[PDB]
Ligand binder design. Structure first.
Ligand SMILES: [Zn+2]
Ligand SMILES: [Zn+2]
Lengths: 217, 345, 70, 65
């Protein structure tokens, strides 16, 4: 909608209610998903205003993508499915790809996962959280492997209330992940990457450690 | 203490910085222009003596980052000095060169080969000032250093021979000028390979001697070799840029950066070489205007990669008009395409 | 094998303790930096606040629909 | 001797680890406190600018439709 022209422009429907959307940083591109069955992931150019792009048939059962981020790098799209166990998938949308490049499915214990963000300092890092668990991701495309960790916070880390948290984000300049809380607090994590002696073995994919908690209001 | 810029008295403060010292207004103004227009304050972080770095790791960190900053500014100052020599601003070159030398003395020490580049710039400025024997001082120092030097690279020695030749070129023996520039050209050829712009700079000075000898065919041959080098390099960039822009398009699209890939001082030297080459190529032999068309193409390409749009357009229009009478359609269509790229970009 | 157990324990724990103390030094660097900038703020701000109070006191002394709805 | 020495050494080491963790978290608590105090101080500046201007000064379109 344009305030000063006072006119609407429109993107035309979905098989279900629109579930989630993210716009490219350049505001050239807009991506959208819908809930329910038969869901489609549908992406658009702002300034044609009658654009098209689509991912068909992304998930059979999956009840539409309940959170989704697009790379500011603009190469990749990445999505979280609504399903009793949720999916994580990455998508080379610059290509006419119509299938997942890489996939993982996660325990229920993490819960509804419904925030996802891309890292402007990276192309192969994403963060997501539920109300009650937060998750770091990295994708090793040469390995063809997507790895996750979802460690559990408890009172013991600070002997303090921490409770429920809502959104998480990649820091401006440091090897860090931020999480914002209903508690009036911010939580921050650091990432640790395969130490050279590990490289000869499993090279346990980068681990996240909850360095710090502070109360801001 | 002294005026560090000339070892005359510290007659006045550098009110811009306090740390710089001037023999009053003339060197105050010239050093203000020369170093302070380029960086000014950054020398203050160099000049400040450190407080105590309290542990081995603190000492190491503080030294490493200070020294590497010093090195970075040493090289930037040396680039600025080179450009001032190429721009003919020898007055402004003298502060920049003397500073770069003194900082090389501090980090490397006077004995270092790393001073030899600065010493040779101080010769070059002296010859811009006509101070031939002063340039002979710093060449003497460099020559002893390199003759002792355990590791002098082919490029480094090419620098030595090139400036040695230039010094004799201010002297009076063309035989020495050829001999030493030939050595410079050899050492450039083996370091860079035979088609580098720096080798071509050697060939250019040789051509200018052959023109002074009025040995028109050899002079023109050298000018051709240099012109072909400049053409080939700029073609390499211009072609790669257009080819990449053409090659493929996802719906993401892209646009590539129009870029010379040169040092600005190398661009100034390119202009000096190509312009003198064009004028001498005409005055020796107007019978080959196509070589002028080639040089005009070369410069129009350079100007486009700079986005010196005005000369890019002018020199392309000249090349096109000459190519229509003198040359096949391939020349004209290239020059038309280049003009269309300039006018669109 | 007992001597190997001793050597391994000694070396590992010596390195562990050195690591942990040097990490404590690393965090102490941040601690000191913050304490410095905190106290710089506290002094300069309290000075400013007090002179604001003085200037505000001087300022104080020296300065001396309904019908349409119906 | 050799065994009893090794075992008691390992026990000592384990308590050394306990101490290391204890102090580490103590310094983390310090950092939290400093962060809070920084925020407090930065806020406290905010008021001061406002008043001085007063000394210089001393010298339903919805219903319309
Ligand atoms: Zn100064
Ligand atoms: Zn002087």
């Amino acid at each position: 909608y344009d305030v000063v022209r006072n006119t609407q422009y429109h993107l035309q429907g979905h098989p279900n209610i629109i579930s989630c959307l993210c716009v490219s940083e350049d505001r050239r591109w807009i991506a959208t998903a819908d809930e329910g069955p038969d869901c489609l992931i549908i992406i658009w150019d702002s300034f044609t205003g009658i654009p098209v792009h689509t991912i068909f048939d992304s998930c059979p059962e999956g009840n539409g993508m309940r959170s989704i981020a697009i790379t500011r790098d603009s190469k990749f799209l990445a999505t979280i499915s609504d399903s009793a166990t949720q999916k994580v998938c990455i998508w080379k949308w610059t290509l006419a790809v119509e299938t997942p490049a890489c996939t993982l499915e996660l325990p229920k214990e993490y819960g509804f996962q419904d925030n996802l963000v891309f890292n402007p300092a990276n192309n192969k890092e994403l963060v997501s959280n539920s109300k009650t668990q937060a998750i770091y991701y990295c994708w090793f495309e040469d390995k063809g492997i997507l790895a996750h960790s979802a460690p559990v916070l408890t009172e013991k880390t600070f002997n303090k209330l921490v409770g429920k948290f809502s959104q998480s984000v990649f820091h401006l300049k440091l090897p860090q992940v931020l999480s914002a809380t209903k508690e009036g607090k911010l939580v921050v994590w650091d990432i640790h990457y395969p130490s050279s002696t590990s490289s000869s073995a499993i090279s346990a994919f980068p681990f996240i450690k909850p360095r710090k908690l502070v109360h801001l209001q | 203490l002294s005026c560090e810029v000339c070892e005359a008295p510290a007659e006045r403060m550098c009110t811009a910085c306090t740390v710089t010292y001037y023999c009053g207004p003339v060197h105050q103004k010239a050093d203000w222009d020369s170093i302070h227009a380029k960086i000014c304050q950054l020398l203050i972080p160099l000049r400040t003596t450190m407080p105590f770095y309290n542990s081995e790791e603190e000492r190491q960190h503080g030294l490493q980052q200070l020294q590497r900053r010093q090195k970075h500014l040493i090289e930037f100052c040396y680039t600025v000095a080179q450009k001032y020599l190429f721009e003919g601003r020898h007055e402004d070159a003298v502060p920049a060169a003397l500073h770069s030398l003194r900082f090389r003395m501090n980090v490397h020490g006077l004995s270092s080969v790393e001073l030899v580049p600065a010493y040779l710039l101080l010769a070059e400025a002296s010859l811009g000032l006509g101070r031939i024997v002063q340039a002979e001082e710093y060449l003497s120092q460099a020559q002893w250093t390199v003759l002792k030097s355990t590791d002098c690279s082919n490029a480094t020695h090419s620098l030595l021979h090139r400036n040695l030749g230039l010094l004799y070129i201010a002297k009076k023996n063309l035989d020495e000028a050829r001999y030493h520039l030939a050595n410079d050209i050899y050492f450039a050829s083996c370091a860079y390979g035979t088609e580098d712009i720096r080798t071509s700079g050697g060939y250019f000075h040789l051509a200018n001697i052959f023109y002074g000898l009025k040995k028109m065919e050899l002079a023109d041959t050298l000018y051709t070799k240099v012109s072909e080098i400049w053409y080939t390099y700029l073609n390499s960039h211009y072609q790669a840029l257009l080819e990449a822009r053409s090659q493929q398009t996802d719906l993401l699209g892209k646009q590539f950066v129009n870029d010379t890939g040169l040092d600005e001082a190398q661009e100034a030297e390119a202009i000096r070489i190509l312009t003198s080459t064009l004028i001498i190529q005409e005055s020796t032999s107007t019978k080959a205007p196509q070589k002028s068309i080639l040089i005009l193409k070369t410069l129009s390409i350079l100007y486009y990669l700079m986005l010196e749009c005005s000369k890019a357009k002018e020199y392309a229009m000249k090349a096109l008009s000459l190519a229509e009478t003198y040359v096949s359609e391939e020349e004209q269509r290239f020059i038309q395409e280049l003009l269309s790229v300039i006018s669109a970009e | 094998h007992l001597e190997r157990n001793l050597a391994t324990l000694k070396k590992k724990v010596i390195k562990e303790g050195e690591l942990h103390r040097t990490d404590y030094v690393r965090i102490m660097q941040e601690n000191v930096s913050l304490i410095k900038e905190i106290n710089e703020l506290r002094r300069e701000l309290k000075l400013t606040r007090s002179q604001i109070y003085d200037l505000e006191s001087a300022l104080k002394v020296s300065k001396k629909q309904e019908e349409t709805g119906r």
